[PDB]
């Protein structure tokens, strides 16, 4: 299949695995061919949410629910006082139940914003009442069992439907992503709303010159502390933060500010909550009549959750239609697929362990059903929205995960650089400054496939396990509580931490990939850590908030990390270095603790030494001429000591002959000399003497 793939041009080591890729591509073409034959193709098949769930047509309301294991089924709700006797559904030969309910005096039989459930029985058992799988909203009562949830028919009148005003922005040259969770986005540890987030937080994201918002925890999840990772109602906007119309307002406002918006797609697993989610449909049937595999294959041991059978036709309808639903109905510009490592392998990456050996990537442990779903998904999404960005969350480093389906790849645009936050946490927790290796830093940042695109980030929320301390807090710890006044000179510990927080974020951005990501609050060095109420912390909720008050006051020093973050993104907007394939690390000086490198058109000098200033430190560069400061972390506006001269011309000298590297300086054909105070990072640009002076 069939027979040379363009991926093999890129990475001829893939040809050893031709048999694997022949089978995968055959499975994909055959699944796509069947969807064309039986469902009118991928664009038609992924409009399932107009067929399943509750849809109002002229004069009547139809509801369909796939439940082959049910033997009788009815629709119940406030609209029939929870008695389904006059609302029995009919079952077709595929186990799809349907009912059509005429309007009552010209009005829909099921009022907008009223509660509903699917009622079914089998085996002569009692009625079981569950939430329709394609419900678009669900709310909890909070009359003890603190639940269960109810499904809510959502069909707002004209006065209450959000109508999008703004077009989607163009795809940027590189994504600079602000990742967020709306419920913990408020000052106080109460659940914040989509409207609050849209009005209070989107402006800050745009002020810091991000161009993309990654919105976590959108799909409904009855367990708040799951951070949106255990999904119950895949078509429903999480109700604790507002309604579907509130989310549409938020996405439209982001677009109005020039920001793209991606949603987290959690199609790697489903919540095991029986009353509230899709696990309610499992009554012990064979996997062909379930959303899920059975036995071990249907259970994720680490996430304590259920695992989809991606070969099942109704599950492909469900998941592909869910992608179209979020894109088309809420105007998203793309998505991140969370937990792709679990999808790619039958062992889910649970006990491993990827060494980069290709045998680990392509073997009987590779889950072809899951890869076929992802290829159909990426073919579909880029056909609906050719400028979409779809990110994969994959720790394994699977080759060709981020090459187009039409080349033989899985079709993602970018993957996350999941190994970089681990390195900084180990360094910050376990290594005295003098033992940090400049070469190990560079290797971690630069260790990637250059034929595929990477989003780098220095730190993250940690919620796939339990949140850890932020970089700032790992640097400064309890001194952040009493040592952040801008009135008083900072202690040595606070001066160290502010300077390294800026340096660690900026080297990560400039060397770590082709896109950048920042989670909400870390751009200003928010202290402490993120955690949600659970047994392990005695049900503490004081950490599920963001203390904007810290960055909004000019009397503290958070404003300085924030100003640097704004300037580092503006620098990328100006020079476009994330989209440059020029990346040359010219000096990893271990004794002096200096790293010099070029990315794009800029020369970067990082002095991680605790106390030494290098005067006249020679740095290699490509083009001769006159260089000046482009961004300097020592500037007073970024809380530094203002030691670097922004007006100073740095003239180059020639270093041997271009392409005779032994005659060059650190393999570079010119050099210039800089001032490099301790714990600073400065990027320099070449003056265009035809256009500047």
């Amino acid at each position: 299949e069939v027979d040379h793939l363009p991926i093999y041009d890129l990475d001829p080591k893939l040809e050893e695995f031709k048999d694997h890729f022949n089978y995968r591509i055959k499975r994909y073409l055959d699944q796509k061919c069947l969807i064309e034959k039986h469902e009118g193709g991928l664009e038609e098949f992924s409009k399932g949410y107009l067929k399943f769930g509750i849809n109002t047509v002229d004069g009547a309301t139809i509801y369909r629910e796939w439940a082959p294991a049910a033997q009788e089924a009815q629709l119940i709700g406030e609209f029939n006082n929870w008695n389904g006797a006059k609302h029995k559904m009919e079952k077709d030969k595929f186990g799809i139940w349907s009912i059509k309910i005429s309007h009552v005096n010209g009005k829909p039989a099921i009022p907008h914003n009223s509660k509903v459930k699917f009622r079914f029985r089998h085996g002569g058992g009692a009625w079981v009442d569950r939430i329709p799988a394609w419900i678009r909203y669900a709310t909890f009562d909070a009359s003890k069992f603190g639940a269960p949830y109810d499904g809510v028919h959502w069909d707002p009148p004209a006065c209450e439907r959000y109508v999008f005003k703004h077009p989607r922005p163009p795809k940027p040259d590189a994504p600079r992503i602000y990742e967020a969770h709306v419920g913990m986005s408020g000052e106080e540890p109460e659940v914040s709303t989509y409207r609050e987030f849209a009005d209070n937080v989107l402006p800050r994201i745009r002020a810091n010159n991000y161009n993309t918002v990654q919105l976590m925890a959108i799909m409904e999840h009855s367990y708040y502390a799951s951070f949106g990772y255990h999904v119950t109602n895949f078509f429903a906007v999480s109700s604790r933060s507002g309604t579907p119309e509130d989310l549409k307002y938020l996405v439209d406002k982001a677009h109005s500010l020039g920001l793209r918006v991606l949603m987290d797609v959690v199609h790697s697993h489903a919540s095991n909550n029986v009353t509230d989610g899709l696990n309610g449909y499992d009554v012990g049937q064979n996997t062909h009549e379930s959303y899920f595999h059975t036995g071990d294959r249907g259970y994720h041991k680490l996430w304590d959750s259920r695992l989809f059978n991606y070969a099942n036709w109704e599950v492909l309808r469900f998941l592909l239609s869910n992608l179209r639903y979020w894109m088309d109905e809420f105007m998203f510009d793309g998505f991140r697929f969370d937990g792709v490592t679990s999808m790619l392998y039958h062992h889910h990456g649970i006990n491993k362990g990827f060494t980069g050996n290709y045998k680990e990537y392509f073997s009987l442990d590779t889950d072809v059903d899951a890869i076929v779903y992802m290829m159909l998904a990426n073919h579909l999404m880029h056909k609906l929205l050719p400028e979409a960005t779809i990110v994969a969350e994959d720790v394994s480093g699977m080759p060709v995960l981020c090459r187009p389906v039409d080349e033989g790849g899985v079709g993602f645009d970018f993957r996350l650089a999941m190994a970089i936050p681990d390195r900084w946490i180990d360094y910050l927790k376990n290594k005295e400054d003098r033992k940090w290796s400049m070469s190990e830093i560079v290797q971690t940042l630069t260790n990637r496939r250059y034929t595929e695109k990477c989003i780098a980030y220095a730190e993250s929320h940690d919620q796939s396990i339990v949140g850890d301390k932020t970089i700032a807090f790992l640097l400064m710890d309890k001194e952040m509580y009493t040592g952040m006044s801008d009135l008083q000179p900072a202690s040595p510990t606070i001066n160290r931490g502010i300077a390294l927080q800026k340096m660690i974020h900026f080297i990560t951005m400039a060397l770590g990939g082709d896109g950048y990501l920042n989670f909400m609050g870390n751009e200003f060095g928010h202290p402490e850590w993120i955690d949600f109420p659970r047994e392990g912390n005695n049900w503490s909720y004081d950490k599920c908030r963001r203390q904007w008050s810290l960055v909004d006051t000019d009397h503290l020093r958070y404003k300085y990390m924030n100003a640097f973050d704004q300037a580092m993104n503006a620098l990328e907007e100006e020079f476009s270095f994330l989209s440059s394939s020029k990346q040359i690390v010219s000096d990893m000086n271990e004794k002096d603790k200096v790293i010099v490198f070029e990315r794009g058109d800029l020369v970067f000098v990082f002095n991680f030494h605790p106390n030494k200033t290098y005067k006249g430190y020679k740095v290699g560069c490509d083009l001769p001429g006159k260089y000046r400061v482009a961004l300097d972390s020592d500037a007073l506006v970024f809380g530094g000591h203002g030691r670097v001269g922004h007006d100073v011309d740095h003239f180059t000298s020639p270093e041997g002959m271009p392409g005779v590297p032994e005659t060059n300086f650190n393999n570079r054909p010119n050099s210039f000399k800089v001032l490099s105070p301790p714990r600073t990072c400065v990027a320099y640009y070449r003056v265009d003497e035809d256009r500047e002076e």
Side-chain angles (χ1 to χ4, degrees), residues 2-461 463-693:
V2 39
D3 12 83
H4 170 88
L5 293 167
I7 49 171
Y8 301 152
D9 300 339
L10 257 24
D11 182 358
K13 295 174 56 182
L14 304 172
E15 299 190 313
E16 180 173 343
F17 299 88
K18 162 185 335 289
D19 286 346
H20 180 259
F21 275 96
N22 295 341
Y23 178 70
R24 181 196 298 194
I25 291 336
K26 165 176 187 49
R27 286 280 314 281
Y28 163 81
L29 290 172
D30 286 348
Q31 193 62 67
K32 185 167 171 291
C33 182
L34 287 170
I35 291 166
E36 288 165 4
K37 177 171 176 196
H38 296 281
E39 296 283 353
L42 282 163
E43 291 178 74
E44 194 74 357
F45 190 44
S46 66
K47 300 176 191 197
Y49 56 88
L50 303 172
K51 297 194 92 184
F52 281 85
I54 298 162
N55 282 279
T56 294
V57 293
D58 216 288
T61 299
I62 294 176
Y63 164 47
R64 308 192 177 85
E65 187 75 42
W66 175 70
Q71 281 196 288
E72 294 170 74
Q74 306 175 344
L75 172 60
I76 60 174
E78 289 177 283
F79 82 97
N80 60 20
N81 303 313
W82 305 101
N83 181 323
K86 297 174 99 160
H87 304 271
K88 297 185 182 160
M89 302 177 65
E90 59 180 277
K91 190 187 205 183
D92 73 8
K93 58 194 192 149
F94 300 120
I96 295 163
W97 294 81
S98 57
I99 183 176
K100 180 197 224 156
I101 304 159
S102 173
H103 281 12
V104 176
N105 297 120
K107 311 239 51 176
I110 308 169
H112 163 67
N113 195 33
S114 68
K115 292 164 186 163
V116 288
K117 284 188 191 181
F118 177 71
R119 167 160 293 174
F120 73 94
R121 62 199 265 207
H122 63 109
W127 294 114
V128 178
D129 294 339
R130 301 290 181 245
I131 313 295
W134 300 66
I135 210 60
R136 310 210 171 145
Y137 196 60
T139 58
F140 56 86
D141 193 332
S143 283
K144 261 282 156 171
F145 40 36
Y149 269 60
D150 287 295
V152 179
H153 180 49
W154 192 250
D155 183 36
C159 33
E160 306 154 10
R161 261 182 75 242
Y162 189 80
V163 160
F164 284 92
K165 300 298 135 161
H166 304 269
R168 290 190 166 87
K171 184 168 70 180
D173 291 326
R176 303 188 305 271
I177 299 169
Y178 194 106
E179 183 181 57
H181 176 288
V182 164
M184 64 163 285
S185 60
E187 179 76 38
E188 283 312 312
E190 271 183 316
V191 185
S192 297
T193 64
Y194 299 119
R195 289 205 90 77
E196 282 158 352
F197 176 95
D199 296 339
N200 302 343
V201 190
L202 294 176
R204 301 172 181 272
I205 298 171
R206 175 64 181 85
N208 279 215
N209 307 120
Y210 293 89
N211 58 31
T212 299
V213 177
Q214 175 75 54
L215 228 35
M216 308 197 65
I218 294 305
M219 294 171 172
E220 183 63 282
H221 48 288
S222 68
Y223 185 32
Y224 192 53
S226 75
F227 209 65
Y229 290 129
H230 292 255
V231 173
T232 44
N233 314 287
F234 285 80
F235 290 78
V237 164
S238 184
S239 56
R240 279 171 202 101
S241 294
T243 78
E245 312 304 320
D246 301 324
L247 179 68
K248 293 183 180 193
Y249 172 76
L250 179 173
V251 174
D252 206 25
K253 190 161 176 159
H255 283 166
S256 82
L257 289 166
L259 296 172
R260 303 245 298 175
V261 189
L262 311 177
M263 201 183 97
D264 281 43
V265 171
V266 188
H267 280 3
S268 55
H269 68 302
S271 171
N272 72 8
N273 182 319
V274 170
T275 57
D276 305 337
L278 287 181
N279 203 26
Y281 286 88
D282 180 9
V283 295
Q285 66 269 38
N286 186 274
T287 188
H288 77 288
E289 293 184 333
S290 187
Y291 291 97
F292 307 123
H293 282 291
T294 53
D296 289 346
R297 189 159 173 200
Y299 181 69
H300 195 113
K301 300 178 179 71
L302 177 71
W303 301 339
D304 187 36
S305 280
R306 292 307 304 284
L307 297 172
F308 289 104
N309 188 334
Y310 297 103
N312 275 351
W313 193 265
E314 293 300 328
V315 171
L316 291 172
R317 190 197 304 280
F318 185 91
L319 295 168
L320 296 163
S321 298
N322 196 53
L323 302 172
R324 169 187 289 274
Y325 175 76
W326 289 123
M327 189 164 340
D328 279 13
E329 300 293 328
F330 290 81
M331 296 296 286
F332 286 104
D333 296 290
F335 297 119
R336 174 173 62 205
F337 277 45
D338 288 345
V340 166
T341 304
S342 186
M343 300 173 65
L344 294 167
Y345 317 95
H346 291 304
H347 56 59
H348 307 303
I350 298 166
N351 301 286
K352 33 222 72 167
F354 299 85
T355 62
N357 174 335
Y358 279 24
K359 284 175 159 29
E360 290 172 353
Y361 292 134
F362 317 119
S363 78
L364 299 176
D365 289 324
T366 304
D367 180 345
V368 169
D369 294 341
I371 288 173
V372 168
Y373 164 54
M374 287 179 294
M375 293 175 66
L376 292 162
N378 281 132
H379 177 76
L380 171 64
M381 288 179 295
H382 298 273
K383 182 67 165 319
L384 294 185
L385 188 73
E387 299 301 274
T389 289
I390 316 302
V391 183
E393 185 185 52
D394 164 57
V395 308
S396 71
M398 175 64 82
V400 311
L401 183 65
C402 306
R403 297 302 311 190
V405 167
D406 68 14
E407 299 176 4
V410 186
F412 288 100
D413 299 295
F414 293 85
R415 107 168 69 198
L416 292 184
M418 301 188 79
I420 288 174
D422 294 348
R423 161 78 66 220
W424 293 128
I425 294 169
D426 176 57
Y427 265 29
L428 287 166
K429 289 189 178 174
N430 303 320
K431 309 211 143 47
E432 323 90 274
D433 286 344
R434 81 141 220 277
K435 297 203 199 260
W436 287 20
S437 173
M438 305 297 95
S439 61
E440 304 237 32
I441 293 174
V442 171
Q443 180 174 355
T444 296
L445 301 175
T446 67
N447 184 23
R448 52 181 190 272
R449 295 179 71 79
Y450 287 88
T451 54
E452 290 183 60
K453 289 181 268 153
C454 175
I455 287 162
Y457 47 108
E459 55 184 307
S460 185
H461 60 259
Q463 297 308 112
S464 63
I465 306 176
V466 153
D468 214 330
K469 292 171 184 184
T470 66
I471 287 328
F473 202 64
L474 287 170
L475 285 156
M476 286 172 278
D477 197 68
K478 291 211 172 89
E479 291 199 29
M480 305 195 73
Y481 300 136
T482 55
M484 291 293 281
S485 170
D486 189 43
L487 191 79
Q488 304 270 124
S491 67
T493 291
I494 289 310
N495 281 331
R496 164 179 184 273
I498 294 319
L500 287 176
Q501 194 265 5
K502 290 179 301 188
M503 299 182 64
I504 289 166
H505 281 195
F506 192 33
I507 194 172
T508 293
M509 186 205 226
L511 283 183
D514 314 286
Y516 182 69
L517 174 150
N518 167 267
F519 185 84
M520 188 173 55
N522 290 333
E523 60 286 4
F524 67 81
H526 193 291
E528 307 184 324
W529 62 93
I530 297 161
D531 202 358
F532 280 68
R534 50 184 189 94
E535 183 245 57
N537 58 25
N538 293 143
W539 307 93
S540 159
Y541 55 92
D542 69 285
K543 302 297 196 286
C544 20
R545 68 208 190 99
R546 298 279 77 177
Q547 298 185 57
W548 299 109
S549 60
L550 298 173
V551 66
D552 288 339
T553 174
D554 287 313
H555 94 278
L556 305 173
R557 288 182 184 283
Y558 299 93
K559 62 192 185 173
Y560 291 132
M561 280 178 288
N562 193 60
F564 181 74
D565 190 69
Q566 176 174 46
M568 165 176 97
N569 287 106
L571 180 71
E572 205 297 313
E573 185 71 11
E574 186 168 4
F575 283 90
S576 309
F577 58 85
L578 287 173
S579 53
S580 179
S581 52
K582 183 181 162 161
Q583 176 182 99
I584 297 177
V585 181
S586 64
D587 196 3
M588 291 171 293
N589 183 346
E590 306 297 347
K591 262 185 266 203
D592 300 331
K593 292 291 192 291
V594 175
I595 293 175
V596 179
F597 62 87
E598 293 154 63
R599 183 72 199 275
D601 293 327
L602 292 175
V603 179
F604 295 80
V605 188
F606 284 74
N607 181 347
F608 281 96
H609 195 90
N611 61 55
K612 281 195 182 162
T613 291
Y614 305 112
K615 301 178 324 166
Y617 191 86
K618 190 193 277 178
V619 299
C621 65
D622 180 10
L623 292 174
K626 192 164 77 164
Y627 286 74
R628 285 180 195 150
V629 168
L631 176 59
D632 160 31
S633 71
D634 202 42
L636 304 170
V637 297
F638 307 134
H641 302 285
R643 295 166 289 200
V644 181
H646 298 173
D647 57 322
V648 173
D649 285 325
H650 296 75
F651 290 92
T652 59
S653 310
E655 292 281 3
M657 282 143 218
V660 188
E662 304 79 350
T663 65
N664 300 334
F665 183 66
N666 292 337
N667 297 332
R668 309 312 291 127
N670 291 102
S671 60
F672 59 93
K673 293 174 182 206
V674 305
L675 182 68
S676 185
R679 295 182 177 132
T680 60
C681 54
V682 178
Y684 299 84
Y685 74 101
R686 182 197 182 264
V687 174
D688 171 339
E689 301 160 13
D690 283 347
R691 294 178 73 98
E692 283 177 67
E693 31 67 350

